[PDB]
Structures are given as C-alpha cells and as structure tokens.
C-alpha cells in the first residue's frame, strides 16, 4: 500500500520523452546483428566529409555547370572570379553540401569550416590565383590589391592542383543562430595572373571547390529542416 | 507520499503482457505435481520428430 | 505490480512546488557557464550595501 500522488504533467504525451514502454512481441528473438561496414554513430562523422559547393549558382548555368567555375583567357588580370558567402543559413553555395544539409536540422552551430579548391585544367596549363578569406564583419574585397592584405593564398596551377583553406570559427557567442546571418564571412578569388594554356589545350579551364566541417564542429537545438515539406502517389494506398 | 505520474500507456490492456495479477483463491494449496512422462518444455522437441 | 493508492492532494498544481519535471529538449547541451563577475548567491549581499 504505497502512498502515492500524481504530479502535474501526469498522463501527458510528450513527443520527445524517453520511457521504457510495453513490448508488443514477448520474448521476440530479434535477428542478430551482423557487421555491416560504415556505421554512423554520430552525425558529425558525415559533416566532417568534403562535398562540392555550387559556386556557379546563377542563371545561365544548368545542372552540372552550376558546380564549376570556368576560367577562360577572356578573364583578365585582377578580375574577381567568384565570391562565396559563408552563410550556411542563407540559401547559397553552402546549402547543398553535407555540412549544409545536416546543419539545417539544427538551430545553433559552432566549429570551423574548411574549403578546398581543386583545379581541373590541363597539365600544361599554368597560372596564378589568389584565394583571400574575408573574416566576418569585413566586406568582400573588389581588387587583388585589397585581397593581398587579409588572409590570401597565392596559388599556382602548374605547381598545385588543390588548395586547402581553413575557415576559422570566429564568434563572440558560443554558437550562431539560424534565422527562421550578416557576413559570417567570405572567400573570394582573383586572377593573380592570366590563364596560360599551350596552343593545343582548351582555353577554358575549370575550378571546383569543396567544403567540409573541421573536427571542432558542433551542433545543437534540433529543428526541422526548411528544405523538404509539402501530391504523393500511393499515399492513400497504405490504407486501401 | 511518493511523487508519481502516469505514463502514456497507463491503464491499457495489452493482450500479450506479463504482469503479476491478484490471486482469486488466497493461500490455495494446489494439487502437487507428479512426474507424468513425456514433458514438453519446448515445441522444437515435437518438430524434431519424424 | 506495486500496490499504490492516491493521497488527497494528488493531481494538484501547487505554484510553489519543487518537483523534477520532464525535459523539453532531450540531451540538450546547454551553453557552458563562464565566470561573469559579481554573482549574487543570496539577496542579503545586496541589502548589505549602502
């Protein structure tokens, strides 16, 4: 005869609770586990991995062309090739990534990003680029002479087909907040020199950039994703 | 005065549960067991047979 | 099958109670504390001041 009494919040259904419920099938022997490769035990294992950025997220780029930035010979010295805003909240080049699409299930995010830009020209094609990292707060540079100051890396094609570039986590707060924002940062790229192809290689070389989160990355306060959500064929066919 | 609260799934009748219920006949002395031959303790003993 | 019974004062909401309730966000990692100066741990620290 235990003397008990009900608290408020008794008999409620909290859709995030964690309580041991009654089993349906008693002494059900489940099918024994079998070592399947590639077990994800934490979603930051997925976010750690590189994935492509749509740097050419414009009109007049269709499908696979929206992934690569074409460097021609028409682009002169000290011309801005691209700028990539570091707003993973905003629907730009970082959304269709592993780091982007998994972070959008989460309101608050921290940790460092990491870009890597691969050059996809010819072997003989040589020329320089300058990848400058604008911190948060600073505006996007417009000239190489401004890009020479901040956090640049003068990269040559013939010497190096890929450049790792760290986006360091700089914030006054322990996280950022995803809105329902203003200059998390920028990476811009200028033609330090021309593009030099020989007389047989194609005069339109292409770049593709990646982004992965680093090891310090962290996410909390789980929301629902903004992307999906809405006709569904055979949706009523489960009942009928 | 134990502070309790009801979970969902309280007061349900699950027809496969296993809970110690109230006895009808108290201190009922049952008829003692007697070694009857051929006790089946698992149904795979039956399935084993031709 | 624990034999319980409800006391009077069951299911009441006492607006000065102190009972461990259900969390909204499970395994929510809160923002870690940081030593901010001038922590008041008792209001007589304020009343002590001119």
């Amino acid at each position: 005869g235990v003397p008990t009494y009900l608290l408020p919040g008794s008999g409620q259904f909290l859709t995030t609770d964690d309580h041991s419920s009654a089993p349906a099938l008693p002494c059900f022997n489940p099918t024994p586990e079998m070592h399947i490769p590639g077990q994800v035990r934490n979603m930051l294992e997925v976010v750690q991995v590189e994935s492509m950025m749509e740097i050419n997220n414009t009109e007049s780029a269709v499908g696979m062309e929206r992934l690569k930035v074409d460097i021609s010979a028409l682009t002169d010295v000290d011309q801005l090739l691209f700028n990539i805003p570091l707003d993973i909240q905003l629907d730009g080049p970082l959304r269709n990534t592993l780091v982007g699409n998994i972070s959008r299930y989460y309101t608050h995010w921290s940790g460092s990003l990491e870009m890597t830009f691969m050059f996809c020209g010819s072997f003989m094609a040589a020329g320089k680029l300058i990848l400058c990292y604008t911190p948060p707060g600073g505006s996007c540079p417009t000239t190489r002479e401004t890009a020479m100051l901040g956090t640049h890396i003068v990269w040559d094609f013939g010497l190096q087909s890929s450049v790792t570039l760290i986006i360091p986590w700089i914030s006054g707060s322990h996280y950022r907040m995803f809105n329902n924002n203003a200059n998390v940062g920028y990476v811009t790229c200028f033609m330090q020199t021309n593009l030099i192809v020989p007389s047989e290689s194609s005069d339109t070389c292409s770049l593709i950039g990646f982004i992965a989160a680093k090891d310090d990355f962290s996410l909390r306060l789980m929301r629902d994703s903004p992307d999906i959500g809405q006709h569904l064929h055979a949706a009523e066919a489960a009942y009928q | 005065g134990v502070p309790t609260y009801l979970l969902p799934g309280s007061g349900q009748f699950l027809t496969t549960d296993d809970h110690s219920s109230a006895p009808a006949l108290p201190c009922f002395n049952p008829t003692p067991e007697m070694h009857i031959p051929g006790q089946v303790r698992n149904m795979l003993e039956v399935v084993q047979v031709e | 099958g624990v034999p319980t019974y409800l006391l009077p004062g069951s299911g009441q909401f006492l607006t000065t109670d102190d009972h461990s309730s259900a969390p909204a966000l499970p395994c929510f990692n809160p923002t870690p504390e940081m030593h901010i100066p001038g922590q008041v741990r008792n209001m007589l620290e304020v009343v002590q001041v001119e």
Partner: peptide
C-alpha cells in the same frame, strides 16, 4: 510479485531445459 501467493506471480519464461531425445529415441 508483491502478492503473498506464488501462482499470482508473472509467467516464468525460463524453462530452457530441453530433452528432444525422449521423443526421437524412446528406446532401450
């Protein structure tokens, strides 16, 4: 079980002691 009687308890799903031989080989 908090009842005084023993049959009032939950089911005992612990009798794993087989003997398949006494049907397949009931010989001597």
């Amino acid at each position: 079980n908090f009842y005084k009687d023993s049959y009032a308890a939950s089911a005992s799903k612990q009798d794993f002691s087989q003997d398949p031989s006494k049907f397949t080989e009931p010989v001597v």
